């Protein structure tokens, strides 16, 4: 039984081809989490791991409406309750986004969250980046392995085996190792991208814009 709510949610999402509608319904309940950081990176934890929530332009306006005396960029060490949220997969540059792995990211799209101001939460372990967890990293690798295998078994055909003579009687034969390079898919670039899941799309706000909106 998984104790980390985030790990279980993000895990199922990946194990279900990024289809948020296929994830257990008994897990789409409100999320009460501790705010570890708020700027330059807004990070919340579930007692075990920390994730980066992506607020929609609506979610923030609603917030500022019901809570005029509360600045989001100052919710550090405070607790919030995300009543309306969704999960979706996105392709990113893991070299720049630390909240991802293997150029893939599971985003927590927040639509509505309430700040339970001054509510002390129970003592927990030090929160770690969910995308740095061994099992979750492995779960993601499994995801790519399945996509890669399906693509290769579709792209590679005809059993183009190196003629045995090329490797036999190779005394006076010289070759270039790049001859063993085989394209995995019909991808456009030099990066594998033949995935089946449909990359989610939703306008989200940059943590910087919300900073200016509260203190130019």
């Amino acid at each position: 039984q998984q104790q980390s709510a985030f790990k279980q949610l993000y895990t199922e999402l990946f194990n279900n081809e990024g289809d948020f509608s296929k994830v257990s319904s008994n897990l789409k309940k409100p999320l009460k989490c501790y705010v570890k950081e708020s700027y330059p990176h807004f990070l919340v934890t579930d007692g075990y791991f920390f994730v980066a929530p992506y607020f929609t332009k609506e979610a923030v306006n609603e917030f500022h409406a019901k809570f005029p005396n509360v600045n989001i960029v100052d919710l550090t060490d405070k607790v919030i309750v995300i009543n309306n949220w969704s999960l979706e997969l996105r392709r990113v540059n893991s070299a720049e986004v630390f909240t991802s792995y293997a150029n893939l990211e599971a985003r927590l799209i927040v639509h509505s969250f309430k700040p339970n101001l001054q509510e002390r939460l129970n003592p927990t372990r030090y929160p770690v980046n969910l995308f740095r967890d061994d099992e979750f990293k492995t779960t993601i690798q499994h995801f790519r392995h399945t996509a890669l295998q399906a693509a290769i078994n579709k792209t590679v055909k005809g059993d183009n085996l190196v003629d045995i003579s090329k490797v036999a009687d190779a005394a006076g034969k010289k070759g270039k190792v790049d001859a063993g390079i085989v394209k995995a898919s019909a991808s456009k670039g030099d990066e594998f991208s033949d995935f089946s899941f449909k990359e989610g799309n939703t306008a989200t706000l940059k943590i910087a814009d919300i900073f200016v909106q509260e203190k130019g």
Binding site: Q1, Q2, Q3, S4, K7, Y48, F49, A102, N103, R125, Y126, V128, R132, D133, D134, E135, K137, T138, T139, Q141, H142, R144, H145, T146, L148, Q149, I152, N153, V156, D159, N160, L161, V162, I164, S165, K166, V167, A168, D169, A170, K173, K174, G175, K176, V177, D178, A179, G180, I181, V182, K183, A184, S185, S187, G189, D190, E191, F192, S193
Partner: protein, 460 residues
């Protein structure tokens, strides 16, 4: 510079004192705030190394050393227990019953590391020789001086360090927790186990498979850059680890930025006994093969003992730099790791073909023996951590006509169209090789631009 022994250092002078000592423990240099870095360690010497033995339990006694600095690079990185450290301008005081030496490197204090063994850890990794036996392999500030009168102190402390580590455990049972009791710990704890496996999880992370005296197996992530000295079959001490309650598929240890992984000097009695006592375990692998999806990695092969000391080469260098790198161009035999994405020919029955050694041609045995000697002609499409993101797959050949890799499958070549037993064994192997988390560790020989497997055999 006058050097004083640990037990004889003044507790009242409060004046700057200097000394030589053996490091038995140390955290990793970690940042505390916006301007401070710290490194805590345990030191010992001929005057302070063991507690009143009678009811002590041969427990080790030691002094502590806390080095403060404004920069990460001004603090010592201890990779191995048993080495020597020289400190200048340190203040001693009693901290909870024990001697605590404090030194502000950002002010006037300084340190220098001396290798107890022939080479430092870093030098062993790069196969380098030490300038001399009086040269520090690491030190703070732009300069370090060694006077003639020090040579004796250093040489003697080295002899002592070896006698100490060979006669005592140094890292006593009270300095670490049994892996099978890790879940009972309230917070963090220490570990002393053997590295059974080093699995490259990705570009910057290694996954260590650990097993200690309790017989319990654990996995932990170890960044390559931070711990480049991790080696299979070696015994290490892990400073500060936590039990991962969120891992259900396998036992996982969590490390922090201040955690450290340390090896032992050659003379280590504890390391020697553990290297022999603790034996490899495959129970985790055997069990994982029964699951449709295993979150545990499984190395299905093993290379001949004569290659165990051979360094590995990534697929990236093997297929993208083998014809442009001076070093790679000089070698014909390499060792590497990868996972099979697809196997050709698709029909397992065609894996064994008839071979005519006169026309250098091979053919299907679906027409029987009328083709010549039976040989394996399998083409593996592989991938690894170094090429995990690119849109490529790489061909690794298994052509045994010349005897290379003939026993890879533990099944002698035969007509798979007629030998049901041989066909079934290869079919199961095929499913294991293409199964997620299955990896191959093999030696390959470069021939006419292609890599052929050799001296490698499945172990499942």
């Amino acid at each position: 510079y006058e050097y004083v022994e640990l037990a004889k250092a003044s507790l009242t002078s409060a004046q700057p004192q200097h000394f030589y000592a053996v490091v038995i423990d140390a955290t990793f240099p970690y940042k505390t705030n916006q301007e401070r870095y710290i490194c805590s360690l345990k030191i010992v010497d001929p005057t302070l190394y063991l507690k009143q033995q009678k009811g002590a339990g041969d427990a080790s006694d030691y002094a502590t050393l806390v080095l403060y600095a404004k920069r990460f690079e001004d603090l010592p990185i201890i990779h191995r227990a048993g080495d020597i450290i020289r400190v200048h301008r340190a203040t001693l005081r009693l901290y909870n019953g024990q001697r605590q030496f404090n030194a502000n490197v950002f002010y006037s204090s300084s340190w220098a590391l001396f290798s107890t063994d022939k080479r430092s850890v870093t030098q062993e990794i790069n196969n380098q020789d030490a300038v001399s036996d009086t040269t520090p392999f690491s030190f703070s500030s732009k300069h370090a001086t060694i006077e003639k009168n020090e040579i004796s102190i250093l040489q003697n402390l080295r002899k002592w360090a070896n006698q100490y580590f060979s006669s005592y455990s140094v890292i006593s049972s009270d300095m670490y927790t049994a892996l099978n009791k890790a879940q009972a710990q309230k917070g963090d704890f220490d570990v002393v186990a053997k590295i059974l496996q080093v699995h490259e999880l990705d570009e910057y992370t290694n996954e260590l498979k650990l097993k200690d005296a309790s017989g319990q197996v654990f996995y932990t992530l170890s960044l390559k850059l931070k711990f480049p000295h991790v080696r299979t079959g070696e015994v290490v001490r892990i400073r500060s680890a936590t039990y991962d309650e969120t891992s259900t598929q396998k036992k996982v240890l969590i490390l922090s930025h201040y955690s450290n992984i340390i090896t032992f000097i050659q003379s280590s009695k504890l390391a020697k006994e553990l290297r022999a006592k603790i034996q490899d375990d495959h129970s985790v692998e055997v069990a994982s093969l029964k699951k449709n999806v295993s979150l545990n990695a499984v190395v299905l092969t093993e290379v001949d003992k004569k290659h165990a000391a051979l360094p590995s080469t990534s697929l990236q260098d093997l297929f993208h730099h083998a014809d442009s790198d001076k070093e790679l161009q000089a070698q014909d035999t390499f060792r590497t790791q990868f996972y099979v994405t697809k196997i050709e020919p698709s029909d397992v029955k065609e894996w064994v073909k008839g071979y005519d050694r006169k026309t250098k041609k091979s053919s299907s045995l679906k027409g029987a023996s009328g083709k010549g000697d039976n040989i394996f002609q399998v083409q593996f499409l592989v991938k690894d951590a170094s090429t995990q993101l690119n849109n490529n797959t790489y061909r690794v050949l298994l052509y045994t006509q010349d005897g290379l890799g003939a026993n890879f499958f533990n099944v002698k070549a035969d007509n798979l169209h007629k030998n049901a037993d041989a066909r079934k064994k290869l079919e199961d192997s095929a499913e294991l090789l293409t199964k997620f988390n299955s990896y191959v560790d093999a030696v390959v020989e470069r021939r006419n631009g292609f890599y052929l497997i050799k001296d490698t055999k499945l172990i499942y």
